[PDB]
Design a protein around this nucleic acid. Sequence first.
RNA 1: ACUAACCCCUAUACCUUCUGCAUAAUGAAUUAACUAGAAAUAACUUUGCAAGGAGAGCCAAAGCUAAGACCCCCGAAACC
RNA 2: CAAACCUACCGAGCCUGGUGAUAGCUGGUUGUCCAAGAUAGAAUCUUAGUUCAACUUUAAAUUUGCCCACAGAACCCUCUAAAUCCCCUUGUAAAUUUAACUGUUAGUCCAAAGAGGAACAGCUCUUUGGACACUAGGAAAAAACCUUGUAGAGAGAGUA
RNA 3: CUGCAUUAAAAAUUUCGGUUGGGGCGACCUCGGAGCAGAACCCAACCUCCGAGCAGUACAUGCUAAGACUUCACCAGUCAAAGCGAACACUCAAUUGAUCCAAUAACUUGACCAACGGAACAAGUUACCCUAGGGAUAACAGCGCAAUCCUAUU
Lengths: 34, 106, 95, 354, 44, 55, 120, 122
Amino acid sequence: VTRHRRVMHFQRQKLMAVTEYIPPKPAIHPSCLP
Amino acid sequence: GGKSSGRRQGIKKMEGHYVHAGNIIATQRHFRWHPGAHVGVGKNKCLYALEEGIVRYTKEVYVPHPRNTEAVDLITRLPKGAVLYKTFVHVVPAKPEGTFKLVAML
Amino acid sequence: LTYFSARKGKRKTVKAVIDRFLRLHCGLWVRRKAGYKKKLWKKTPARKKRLREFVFCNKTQSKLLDKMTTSFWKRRNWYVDDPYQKYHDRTNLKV
Amino acid sequence: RRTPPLGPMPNSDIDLSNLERLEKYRSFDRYRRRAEQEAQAPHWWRTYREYFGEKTDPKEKIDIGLPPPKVSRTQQLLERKQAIQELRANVEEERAARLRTASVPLDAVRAEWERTCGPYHKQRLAEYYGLYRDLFHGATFVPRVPLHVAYAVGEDDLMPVYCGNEVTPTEAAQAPEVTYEAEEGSLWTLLLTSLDGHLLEPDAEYLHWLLTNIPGNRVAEGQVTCPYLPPFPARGSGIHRLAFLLFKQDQPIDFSEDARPSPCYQLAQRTFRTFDFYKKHQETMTPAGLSFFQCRWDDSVTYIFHQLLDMREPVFEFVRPPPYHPKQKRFPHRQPLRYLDRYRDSHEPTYGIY
Amino acid sequence: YKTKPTHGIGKYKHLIKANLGTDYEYGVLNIHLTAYDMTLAESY
Amino acid sequence: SKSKNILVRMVSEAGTGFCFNTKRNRLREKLTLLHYDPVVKQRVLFVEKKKIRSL
Amino acid sequence: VARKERGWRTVFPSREFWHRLRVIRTQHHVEALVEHQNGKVVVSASTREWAIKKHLYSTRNVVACESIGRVLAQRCLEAGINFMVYQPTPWEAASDSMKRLQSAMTEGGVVLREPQRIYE
Amino acid sequence: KFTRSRIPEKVFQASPEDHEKYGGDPQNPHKLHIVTRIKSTRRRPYWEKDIIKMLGLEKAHTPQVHKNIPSVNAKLKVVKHLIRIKPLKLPQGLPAEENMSNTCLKSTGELVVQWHLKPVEQ
RNA sequence: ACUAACCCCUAUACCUUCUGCAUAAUGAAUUAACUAGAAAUAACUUUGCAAGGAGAGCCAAAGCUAAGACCCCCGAAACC
RNA sequence: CAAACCUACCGAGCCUGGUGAUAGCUGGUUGUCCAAGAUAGAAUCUUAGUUCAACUUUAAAUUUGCCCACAGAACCCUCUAAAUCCCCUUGUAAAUUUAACUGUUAGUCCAAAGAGGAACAGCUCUUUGGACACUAGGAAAAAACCUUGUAGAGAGAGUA
RNA sequence: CUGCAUUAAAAAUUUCGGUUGGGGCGACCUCGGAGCAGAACCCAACCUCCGAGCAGUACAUGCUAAGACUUCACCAGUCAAAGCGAACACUCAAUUGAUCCAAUAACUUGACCAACGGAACAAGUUACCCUAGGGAUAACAGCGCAAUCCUAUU
Ligand SMILES: [Mg+2]
Ligand SMILES: [Mg+2]
Ligand SMILES: [Mg+2]
């Protein structure tokens, strides 16, 4: 609990980068589908 | 001030521990544990085993002595059907008192 | 402690330990309890009882007293009707 | 970290929203009544009875007794309710009750108990004494027929045996008197065994008396399968219990296999076990009543051992385990001078090589 | 113990408690029984 | 830290010479107690003789 | 010589006995029960039994207490039990009926003080 | 404060989706384990160092066989982040005394009892 | 290392003091010579003898005798 | 009366002797090779030291030692915390006792939980773990971050 | 003149306990309870405080003796079956002080030694100062931090 963004540990930083959300991607952009 | 150190009070022998007569089971500032079967208590509420055997911890019904007015007042105000429970420690004797053996042939 | 005296060139003995401790030939040392004659009125009978026995010393204190005492006091004595005669030897001692 | 309980909480049923509305114990006795009614109830946690209380097998105890007698409850209740109505009617009886001066005849009420609750109390008491666990290897029996035995001593005095009382071997030197109710056409078997009298095999036991095929109450004409032998409890061996067993025979039974020579002064021959004896007989055997008493050593036991058995009397002693001491250390710190005496074996002085 | 499932079995003060009337019931009511006979006054 | 009590010596009246110490109030008469005497193996009267100190 | 169940100094009643006498006083009947420490009951004398009912006026009076007291005294005498223990509450110990019940033990030959265990 | 980890029991339940993905048979569990340390014991708590010591995993990339029993499994779960666990396959069965010197643990996880160092004629 | 001295690549002097010195903390221009771990109470190892050992004395309830093996240098302001 | 001067350093001259004065302080402490080897505390005119204890070393005797399945360790008080103690199996080879002493306990940084009149950081101080004062590789240079240890030669290879 | 006493005078020897940036003025040093330290034990400050340096009731508050616990050492402190002997291991968180020595026929007693593990008894000032050291420790300067402050935007 700090006011200077509390700089993150490298190991914790890699954990967040790996566990980032990935939206599902359609095969065809619905916008170009009949 | 307040630079006092710990009193080193707690459980000395855990459940299922083999003990001898006179071994201290636990020491406490208040009656956290209550003596059960073949367990004695001193003035300082220290718990020791009068017999030699296996230490056991169980939960039993608390029935205070009638001369204990403070506790007698407590259980009189309880709702009907309420039963107080407290943790009790007992030791289970292992060896028998003795044996009968031949000593003479007269 | 005088390791080498100026008149004989030999180790001396601290007389302080002689007046306070008793050594058994087995190597054990026997002492009293501090304050066993001080303020007896403010002590419980159980405390006073355990204050007036003769107790042994541990390994470090025994080594401490041996170094401060010459070999004269470590000999075997044969005093007549000595009260501590039976305690000079250990019986049934394993390791 | 928390773990949900494996069962209902002791005080979960009580509502706490209307705790002041709920009535209180208001007395010590009412809480105590609830205390030990709830104490005997089973629980899913560790209890005192789990470690200390004796454990019984899940199988129900097998009963080998006679079928219970059948009575008319309504008629019995009507007679009982009218009996006390007239009893309460008398002013003299009521005067004694209010004055706390009334008395009851102890002899008369005991006789009534022997017919009403006698068999049940005797069975309950016999279970406590361990008769059912040692012999029969675990069973239950109700002594429906009462049995009275009194030992003849002197010229007028008697030594009755009801249950678990104390009778000296001197008073049991001679054959006792057996009195019990029966009718014609009934065959009876009498057996006496010493539960704790065995000197060699702890599991086995010693037979002391055996009467078979008793015509009614006439015990004189019964067949003497084994001669009567007075008990011989060894001095210092504790206190022994001797049980009188009464059997009812539906048909005549041959006892040649279990017959013993007269006199039977051999301990090996006198050895007998009720188990495998009732087992081989239960097809035509059923018990009728039991009675037992406790026996100690006296001067007469010396006569029995030396003359009747032609042997030396054994003397036993109760020996306690030696006291426990911790392992002796080279440097016992802060221990009294008497510490070395605990591990000393002899108090005499020693001099080694000198 | 807290971790064990039998935690809190010794809790006892939760069964023990730690005028304006309502809209259906009355707040406080007092009755007065005067009499020249003390025995009758207390008996009632 | 006013000293309100005093330590006094109790001497047996049996003549054995046995003594023991007990605390007493300053504003009080001399105490004649009944105490066990190890010499005579029985309880006998003890009377106060001297004042030891003030506590 | 049998060891007694020592302890339980913080609860009532204590358990340092071999045989205990328990007397139960209900609304209609009074039950006198004698049992061992381990739980097994040896002998009982309750007013419910028809044997003593024919001779007693009521089952909830001092006369009833004397009736079962002598009955229990004769039952204990013929069962071989001579020594026992009684641990009543202060009010029941002060009840007049109980004291006369103790008198039944004295005249019956029953002693309510168990002998001390010989440790050595 | 940094202390030991109590791994939830829910992690070790083989759902049917994992069964055909890894090829394991719940009805016929594998008899033995292959354990291989692939991470340094340094910069790790001391209690994990002792567990690695007990299982004989000192030198990295050195296969070791262990019994698939709850006691061994309990120890393995502590250091599951430092080792690789594979089942043991015996296509030729348990080796006999005659071929005890002819065994060879191939990299795919089976112990073939016939090692000839000769090209397959097929 | 190289055919090749250099050119290529790699590499933050020594001692001491501190958690941590390439440290811009001390010491050293260089050479030669001189310059700093002294003791056997107990214990350990190895012989001799053995309920005795020791070349008066001393120790001994397997001990006694003998041997081996552990304890530094320079520097004050002062006092008489 | 400037605390001046008394043979070119007088708050008490100089020389010799006691004297190899003492110094818990500074500096120093000489041939080769191998092995074991680090951070609980208490007392102290004591925190620049010393003693006990802990840790560490050597030799000897003995048998259990670490890990840990259930069961078990409080109530008034639900930060209902992470977790500890105890502990059969199993994996393993250590552990306890006896004898003999030296040396260290003026530490640093990181991750986490905290404390310092109800201070987001910073400063100081506790607790758990790791690293450093022991090798190498990688983050630009890098004591404390990541990878990795048991030791040599090779102009081999697979990886972190 | 000598010896022994009492007053002065002039002198002799020795010392300046620690903690609180410094000084002034003050505060603290020993013991116990809660908070940190949430669940075996333990765990620190400049820590937040609150208290303690007694009293009461006994007069078997007698004598022996297994087995145990501990304020992280020692010293010290605590519980206790059983037996003897009596009746029919007191309350209270702390409520305290070692050795030597003194008194005492003896049993016993003697401390605000509170700097509370206590030296039998010793204060100030030095800018006239000296020695051995310390950036483990101040001022000068450097570096960390921006508590605050300034500016610039919403
Ligand atoms: Mg504290
Ligand atoms: Mg010098
Ligand atoms: Mg090494």
